[PDB]
Amino acid sequence: PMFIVNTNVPRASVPDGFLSELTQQLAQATGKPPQYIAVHVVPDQLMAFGGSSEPCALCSLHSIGKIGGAQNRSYSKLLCGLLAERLRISPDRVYINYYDMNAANVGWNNSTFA
Amino acid sequence: PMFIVNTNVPRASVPDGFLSELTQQLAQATGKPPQYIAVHVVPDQLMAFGGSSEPCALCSLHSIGKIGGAQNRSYSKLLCGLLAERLRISPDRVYINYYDMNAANVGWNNSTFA
Amino acid sequence: PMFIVNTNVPRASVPDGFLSELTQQLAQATGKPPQYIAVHVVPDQLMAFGGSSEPCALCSLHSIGKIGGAQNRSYSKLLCGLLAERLRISPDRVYINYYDMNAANVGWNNSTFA
Ligand SMILES: O=C(O/N=C/c1ccc(O)c(F)c1)C1CCCCC1
Ligand SMILES: O=C(O/N=C/c1ccc(O)c(F)c1)C1CCCCC1
Secondary structure: OEEEEEEOOOHHHOOOOHHHHHHHHHHHHHOOOHHHOEEEEEOOOEEEEOOEOOOOEEEEEEEOOOOOHHHHHHHHHHHHHHHHHHHOOOHHHEEEEEEEOOHHHEEEOOEEOO | OEEEEEEOOOHHHOOOOHHHHHHHHHHHHHOOOHHHOEEEEEOOOEEEEOOEOOOOEEEEEEEOOOOOHHHHHHHHHHHHHHHHHHHOOOHHHEEEEEEEOOHHHEEEOOEEOO | OEEEEEEOOOHHHOOOOHHHHHHHHHHHHHOOOHHHOEEEEEOOOEEEEOOEOOOOEEEEEEEOOOOOHHHHHHHHHHHHHHHHHHHOOOHHHEEEEEEEOOHHHEEEOOEEOO
């Protein structure tokens, strides 16, 4: 799985251990080994949500399977919770795009997961 | 809707009010309330288009519905026009990927839009 | 085609000519005219792969067609090879998401490719 967070929150406001927490929590939530989890946080972005520049986040979670109605609701609760607690971003100013990737469309280690 | 623009144009060349203009124009074009529109501009990027480092932009527009042949052509005219007028980027050096998202695959406020 | 690479490798470690090499190699691999190839490299990123902050890369390749099982394996060999040789990133710390875009969903020059 791959989780990316783009936010206007300042780099200094991202707490130590944030990437490790995301990795652990996502491994738990998706049921995939943490060794396969990639996380990426991009602070200090020029963005607006609803026409406002208050703290917000635009994210994406890509996974080969483990994507669906109920699972995505669970992921959203978990991730919005983390963003709210760690980055002080209101859940209603967070968008998370979920992508169910086909194994043949994910490259890794000179080949794909097909 | 979520609109992201990545460009090699310098931050200083992005006019004040650009995010607000994108928000307003997108609300009008998509027919959705501005409160749901998210915009993200990323300047000073290391990119090339056609092998050239002249001004260019790689963008994406994600929306739950309101994506299709005719609509996308209209979105492209609007957005390329704005990029040309505000950032001085030639329309033929702009790529905009459109994504019609399923409500179940968009997280927001601790849940999804499903 | 559009290729984007996000990495924690420092800007200074990206060799001169890297964007041109990616452009030429992608033109060759996809069979697409070089003038239609867009490349974007984003260094100095805050990311982790498998919980580790050792050099890694999260990438994406979007193309209208020319995406499939065998082709993606070939693209992965090519791109991981380039990332390993030029940025010193181990192939097993690279993820590349492949997207087969519909011509109607790609905007360019005030319209789409439909
Ligand atoms: O590592 C990933 O997650 N997928 C794991 C996975 C679980 C079961 C399975 O059968 C697979 F083929 C792959 C990918 C990383 C790149 C973005 C898509 C998910
Ligand atoms: O807020 C968004 O736009 N979609 C709005 C929307 C309009 C009509 C509709 O029936 C929907 F289910 C959703 C999403 C934000 C995340 C990226 C995809 C668009």
